[PDB]
Design a binder for this molecule. Structure first.
Ligand SMILES: Cc1cc2c(cc1C)N(C[C@H](O)[C@H](O)[C@H](O)COP(=O)(O)OP(=O)(O)OC[C@H]1O[C@@H](n3cnc4c(N)ncnc43)[C@H](O)[C@@H]1O)c1[nH]c(=O)[nH]c(=O)c1N2
Ligand SMILES: Cc1cc2c(cc1C)N(C[C@H](O)[C@H](O)[C@H](O)COP(=O)(O)OP(=O)(O)OC[C@H]1O[C@@H](n3cnc4c(N)ncnc43)[C@H](O)[C@@H]1O)c1[nH]c(=O)[nH]c(=O)c1N2
Lengths: 539, 537, 53, 53
């Protein structure tokens, strides 16, 4: 028998990030994993800005960057018949087009990077243990029972062969795409990788229309006597040929992610195809949504109803990414159609298409233009979906509305990020300075606590926040941004992005979402802080 | 539970043993009492032998990405305090151009500064990935040995349960108060407050007797921590975590008892001068693992394991005595300033004014101070010979009849390459498809390798016979023009000390076990007898 | 270079030049595509020569 | 320093100036005999002596 506050079943990105955050917040956790090691395979490698912002908040962004390939080396996607064959063209993937890159820089202090899951996992798992989480591998969750005060789970130890029980206040189901935890909580659902080595002496990612195969990276992956590798390369005048692995995926999202004291996250609540690099990133963001809420509830600073916001905020995103990843698959077949090929052409059919594509006729021109259109429409799955990645819009009892209408989106909300300071949107990034060194708005906030941002004519917020803090027993850090202060609006970018007057305030949750906005520091405005915070905390 | 090897401890020694044993196809269970890898500032100087090991197993590039390269380690400063007067500087970690050349010539690898805080998780994750079972919050309580194996009792600090593990061997990698070594009855001979802090202010030695300062975040070596003031030393700038290390200087005279092998701090406990501890501990593991693997696979006799004590015990004594002796180089600095070992602020102020005296007496003091500062270098990068000049004598090294050539220059300060059996294979650059590759990169990977040139082609057939007969892999590399590996710079011919048709047999740990002068019939016939002798067969 | 340094042109010279790290690989061959006889460390590129430099 | 180049041709057993003669020299330089090892060593020695220039 063991006892903990939270039992975390699974030590992939979702579980390991939950353990790390809970341990940083002073909460006792036990994280288990069935297997001997972290994940070995080529799996994820695209890390998006929201994940990198989370790592930045907890102090792991610089270690992530030292293991990763920066964004400048991710842009060249090549569409071809094979590596040696004819190139159809290229596309600027991962926001490498100058305009896309500007939109990227404006959105976040962080950037895309290429960091194999193979490295990402042990980095976060070692951090969880260092910060205080108990971590135990070769240990399998078999089931649990729940009562009025907690949960009791049965675990099988694969080193000793012993079974034992663990008693917890809450269980996190971070146990992947066939989650037993989710099955036991009764959650409702709706909806070949080949490593090899070779010297390819004679861009960053190749899409081969052979229907579609992918090739990247001495060591290579494409997606046992594997002369699929020939064909893709495609010659046989060069010669390894394994390890080989498979992923069966059945597209489904949990409609609800919570049942009593059980919270599921990650692939356990969203299972989808890998198009867009959304899985690991969304899974880490699920953890970041939940952990601070658990910590407040366990410390008695919030009522248990604060936990209802997890489902209300993260379930819509589960459905969104599943549908989006699926839709992005449909953008590849039109490439074959533009060449006047069927989805699985013969060698003779392909050969004819290549000659036809170079024809000096009007028919040839029509095909070249159609091919370019089709290739351009794949970018939604390969870096174009910046809006999908960033445009979270939360509606829950952990976001206190300010009475303003939803302004919607000026441009397409899938392709383009739109900054907003309305409650329910992520705090916008802009550069300020601290001692003449650039610092992001995001660097003022987070660290497991609420933060209130204002300017010099909003000095009354400091005292108002101290009262609410004292009264509710919760930390509220106040930052008064302006000339001569600790943090300075050196570029004028804060006044430009805040959408409110200098004396207004933004209350920012530990996960960086705006929970309350006030237009000014009038007595009526100031009195609302205490009512918003009580409402957010269910008190 | 049952495993081939139980590894008690997951520091550098244990984690490296687990990684190597897993890479060799051996089942192991590595345990650690605590929840995490080591949190503290502890080791940070990684030497070339350790970096070579990481290179052999494919972790050198990951280590380098986490580390600070050698170009940022050289500036050691001797002073009264950070804001006070500087006595002078010394080129530490082989940063002087001549020391740097000697360093480059010795190895494909380089010093780097890599905190143990990052080193440990990198190796522990690799061990699990490659097949080791790894289990933290698990404590070794004791064991009993019989003629077929060992049975250990473990306490699980998650479940509170005790259970037993059955193994063929136990590795005691359990640190400076090793319970394993105490239970194996090993005989021993031979006779710091670290303060982290943050402040807005490469290495400072403060003669205040001596304090060190390095690195927003700083370490020097809880409101009484205005020791930090004094060292900085002002208080016009605005104090934990604090930690202690007791070390009692001791080395194990023997490192093995029956089926128990101890390694690392468990067999060599010493002061931190010279950055020898972690490095020596990783090298103990690299000596043992391939031997254990051959024995467990039935390709070597159990007597191969006797060479672990014969090769590694002399190193244990050597580093303990060396680290201690380097401490004695600091007090002469106070003596050159004509100060007592703990001077007052007034006495030191007077020493500083005398040190600038425009007389012949002042010039004598300036020269004496320089001489004393220069003699500290043996503990701060000067001991390249100590780091690299391993000379093994054992049944796992087959002598070639030649006398020991000794050392032309001082064997502590200077590395001397040798290809005589019992010395480390020398590094030189060859090419493979016009890309530079080290001699070391031809060898290792858990197996024996035989190196020769084009007139030594007969070695290929001889090695095949021995390999087939003994059931062991022997990779043969024929170095020359038109071959897979080419002597593009001529450096192999220059370093090998034998004719082109001679051969060097290199062990999995990169030590030379056999050398042949030529490929005559008498020379070729010796291979099989050397390999049998090395394997105890 | 010492002369250029004395008169204040060394940094301009360096901005126009290729540094010493890119001068060492001298290759002896029958032709560029043919067989290579071997290489030599030119312009003090051997580590000992570089130290002396 | 000019006089250090001709010993390279001599180590290959070539005269100072045909394509056939050179082709033979490259095959002999890979010869597995003790004579081939002598030629490889002589060639290296000759190449090394050009470093003065
Ligand atoms: C080919 C490919 C390529 C990509 C991606 C997937 C695939 C298949 N993804 C998605 C990503 O790999 C996936 O979404 C994450 O691994 C999900 O992380 P989780 O922590 O939810 O599950 P994960 O599956 O990673 O972890 C589940 C954990 O639970 C453990 N477990 C299961 N049952 C257990 C039990 N009963 N008891 C104890 N432990 C148990 C498992 O052992 C494992 O540790 C991605 N994403 C992205 O953002 N960018 C990208 O580029 C890609 N690319
Ligand atoms: C301040 C300072 C600074 C330096 C150094 C030391 C110190 C104190 N060193 C030396 C270096 O840190 C030391 O030599 C190594 O950590 C030794 O590694 P081990 O694996 O042998 O022991 P280590 O002590 O690292 O690990 C022992 C393991 O066993 C575990 N354990 C103990 N008893 C157990 C039991 N009964 N059951 C289960 N687990 C148990 C412990 O929890 C731990 O995992 C160094 N070296 C260097 O090369 N360069 C440098 O710069 C420095 N600097």
């Amino acid at each position: 028998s063991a006892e903990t506050d939270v039992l975390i079943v699974g030590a992939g990105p979702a579980g390991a990030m939950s353990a790390t955050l809970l341990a940083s917040l002073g909460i006792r956790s036990l994280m288990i994993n069935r297997w001997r090691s972290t994940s070995p395979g080529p799996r994820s490698h695209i890390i998006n800005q929201r994940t990198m912002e989370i790592l930045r908040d907890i102090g792991l962004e610089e270690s992530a960057k030292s293991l990763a390939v920066p964004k400048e080396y991710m842009g060249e996607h090549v569409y071809a018949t094979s590596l040696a064959g004819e190139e159809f063209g290229r596309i600027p993937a991962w926001a490498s087009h100058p305009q896309a890159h500007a939109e990227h820089e404006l959105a976040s202090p962080s950037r895309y990077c290429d960091l194999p899951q193979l490295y990402f996992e042990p980095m976060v798992v070692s951090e969880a243990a260092l910060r205080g989480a108990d971590v135990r591998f070769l240990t399998e969750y078999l089931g649990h029972v729940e009562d009025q005060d907690g949960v009791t789970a049965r675990l099988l130890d694969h080193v000793s062969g012993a079974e034992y029980e663990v008693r917890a206040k809450y269980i996190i189901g971070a146990d992947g795409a066939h989650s037993l935890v989710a099955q036991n909580a009764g959650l409702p659902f709706e909806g070949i990788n080949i490593e090899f080595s070779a010297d390819l002496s004679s861009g960053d990612m190749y899409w081969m229309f052979r229907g579609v195969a992918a090739l990247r990276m001495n060591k290579w992956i494409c997606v046992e006597e594997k002369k699929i590798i020939h064909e893709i390369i495609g010659t046989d005048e060069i010669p390894e040929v394994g390890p080989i692995s498979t992923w069966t995926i059945n597209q489904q999202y949990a409609v609800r992610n919570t049942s009593g004291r059980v919270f599921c996250m990650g692939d356990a609540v969203h299972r989808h195809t890998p198009m867009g690099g959304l899985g690991l990133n969304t899974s880490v963001q699920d953890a970041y949504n939940l952990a601070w809420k658990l910590a407040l509830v366990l410390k008695g600073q919030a009522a248990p109803t604060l936990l209802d916001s997890y489902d209300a905020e993260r379930s819509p995103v589960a459905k969104q990414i599943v549908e989006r990843a699926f839709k992005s698959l449909s953008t590849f077949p039109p490439v074959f159609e533009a060449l006047s090929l069927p989805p699985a052409p013969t060698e003779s059919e392909m050969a004819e298409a290549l000659v036809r594509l170079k024809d000096a006729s009007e028919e040839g021109a029509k095909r070249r233009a159609a091919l370019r259109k089709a290739m351009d429409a794949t970018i939604i799955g390969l870096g174009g979906g910046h809006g999908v990645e960033l445009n979270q819009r939360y509606v829950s009892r952990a976001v206190f509305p300010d009475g303003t209408p939803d302004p919607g989106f000026v441009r397409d909300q899938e392709f383009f990020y739109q900054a907003s300071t309305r409650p329910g949107a992520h705090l916008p990034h802009v550069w300020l300075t601290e001692n003449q060194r650039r610092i992001s708005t995001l660097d003022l906030c987070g660290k497991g606590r609420f933060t209130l941002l204002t300017g010099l004519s909003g000095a009354a917020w400091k005292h108002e926040a101290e009262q609410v803090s004292q009264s509710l027993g919760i930390e509220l850090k106040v930052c008064v941004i302006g000339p001569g202060q600790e943090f300075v609006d050196t570029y004028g970018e804060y006044a430009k992005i805040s959408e409110i007057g200098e004396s207004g305030a933004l209350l920012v949750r530990p996960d960086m979402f705006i929970a309350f906005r006030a237009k000014d520091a009038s007595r009526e405005g100031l009195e609302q802080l205490n009512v918003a915070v009580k409402s957010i905390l269910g008190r």
